[PDB]
Amino acid sequence: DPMALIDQLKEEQKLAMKAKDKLRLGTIRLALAAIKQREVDEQITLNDDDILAVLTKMVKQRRDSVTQYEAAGRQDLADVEQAEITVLEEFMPQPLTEEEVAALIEKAIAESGAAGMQDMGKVMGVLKPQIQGRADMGKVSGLVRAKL
Ligand SMILES: [Zn+2]
Ligand SMILES: [Zn+2]
Ligand SMILES: [Zn+2]
């Protein structure tokens, strides 16, 4: 039952403001503005996975700015962008460990009653939402194929 990402971002905004941590505050504010943009423009309420997509795009855009700054010799500016990325990445999940993936697979097999390679789709359909972008699906496939 982790705190919703929207609430983690708002709490971190309040703390960064009280800390007078200027760069951190500014980047959190931009994440919250990107969330508001989607909720107004798409007429939806974002969940955690939606917010993770918001953060992933912000990290991508800043990573492309790092590329441009570093190609121009402006490491000082690329470092500011890296500091922004580090703030954003605080809210992102860690990749699943090998042992974590193996456990998800064994749980997916137990609950789906999977037996044999014909049940590859049955298992992967259970796993795919649970794995998100936290593991290589091809490797997960191969681990599942082994057990089946
Ligand atoms: Zn923090
Ligand atoms: Zn920046
Ligand atoms: Zn977290």
Side-chain angles (χ1 to χ4, degrees), residues 2-13 15-19 21 23-56 58-59 61-67 69-131 133-144 146-148:
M3 168 176 284
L5 278 188
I6 186 64
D7 294 320
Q8 300 192 21
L9 285 165
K10 292 170 167 178
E11 292 286 344
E12 193 75 34
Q13 171 179 252
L15 178 48
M17 180 266 321
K18 287 180 178 197
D21 287 350
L23 178 158
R24 182 178 157 213
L25 176 57
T27 286
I28 298 297
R29 290 222 168 108
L30 291 169
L32 289 164
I35 291 163
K36 183 187 171 182
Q37 179 278 312
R38 290 194 64 192
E39 302 191 324
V40 177
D41 287 359
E42 290 162 43
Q43 287 296 293
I44 62 177
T45 308
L46 301 193
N47 60 31
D48 284 351
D49 291 314
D50 297 321
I51 291 166
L52 286 182
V54 170
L55 299 173
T56 298
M58 284 176 75
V59 171
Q61 286 174 339
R62 281 149 186 79
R63 216 114 75 176
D64 283 322
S65 280
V66 170
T67 298
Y69 282 139
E70 291 190 343
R74 299 301 309 274
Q75 191 63 55
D76 56 346
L77 298 175
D79 286 359
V80 171
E81 303 298 290
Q82 182 53 56
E84 295 164 8
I85 290 168
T86 294
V87 164
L88 299 163
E89 285 182 338
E90 183 185 64
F91 304 95
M92 294 161 40
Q94 281 307 110
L96 291 157
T97 70
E98 286 156 351
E99 299 88 351
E100 284 175 323
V101 169
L104 288 169
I105 293 169
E106 289 175 0
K107 188 172 172 279
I109 291 167
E111 287 167 0
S112 75
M117 271 296 311
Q118 64 278 344
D119 284 342
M120 177 84 15
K122 182 177 305 177
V123 175
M124 295 307 306
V126 166
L127 289 176
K128 180 260 191 187
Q130 303 170 345
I131 285 179
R134 299 176 73 196
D136 184 295
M137 285 298 190
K139 301 178 172 200
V140 180
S141 296
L143 288 167
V144 176
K147 271 215 156 62
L148 302 174

